[PDB]
Amino acid sequence: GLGPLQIWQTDFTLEPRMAPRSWLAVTVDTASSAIVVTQHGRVTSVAAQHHWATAIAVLGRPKAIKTDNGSCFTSKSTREWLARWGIAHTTGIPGNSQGQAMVERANRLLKDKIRVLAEGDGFMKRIPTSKQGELLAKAMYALNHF
Amino acid sequence: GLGPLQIWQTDFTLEPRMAPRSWLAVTVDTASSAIVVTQHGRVTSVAAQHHWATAIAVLGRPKAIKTDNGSCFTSKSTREWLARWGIAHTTGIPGNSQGQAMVERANRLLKDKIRVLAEGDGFMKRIPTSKQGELLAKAMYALNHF
Structure with missing residues (x-):
């Protein structure tokens, strides 16, 4: 089984173009570099569990x-939620190159895409609430199935 | 490129254990047989586009x-939404074995899993609204990453 290990990096990033639910939870699969993004109203333990x-x-x-x-x-x-799933968890510093670099790069890529796509549709500022989900799904598609 | 073609089958199925948003839109990838399920309040053109x-x-x-x-x-x-994406679309009869059999099998598998999981958590009837998303995501995981 010489293929790659299954480890993710996860953080939250603030995107006001997606308000009221402007907190994006972003996960990078460090092996394949696949990106999962969800949209949240607040950053809480539960919003992290829902995203995962x-x-x-x-x-x-x-x-x-x-x-x-x-x-x-x-x-x-x-901690309980993770144990319930059997997923080891390892912390770090806010910006710990060790295990926060990949996902920080990914926040930036994701916000760029969101801006480029939003402006193509003529949304300079905030994205109409009813457009947000399809637009976020299209930014994910782009960054993954590029 | 002798690997498989990329064609899906999609339908809606009613699951009252997931009320108020009791309409599940289910997509089968006919090659790999991967299942995507989302939760909807009503079946409309827009709920179909959001799911896709x-x-x-x-x-x-x-x-x-x-x-x-x-x-x-x-x-x-x-029709416009599909053309905007360049995805050919082919219709059928409600239950057209030709191109509705795979996804009908999948509705049934999905409802079974939802019941088995819901009851394991002690929900005999309706699933508490705040539990529904994680439970639906776990039923999808199970049926895919089995």
């Missing part, structure tokens, strides 16, 4: 998840 | 989509 529930259905269950020391990732709640 | 927007981000853009003659799939709206 989506990412699992999209990429399959990983062996480990690399995050920073954000409370939504260190809460007893989340 | 999600499926594209998950499976990539297909060449063709097999559906029945449901209006939400034959509306001028949807």
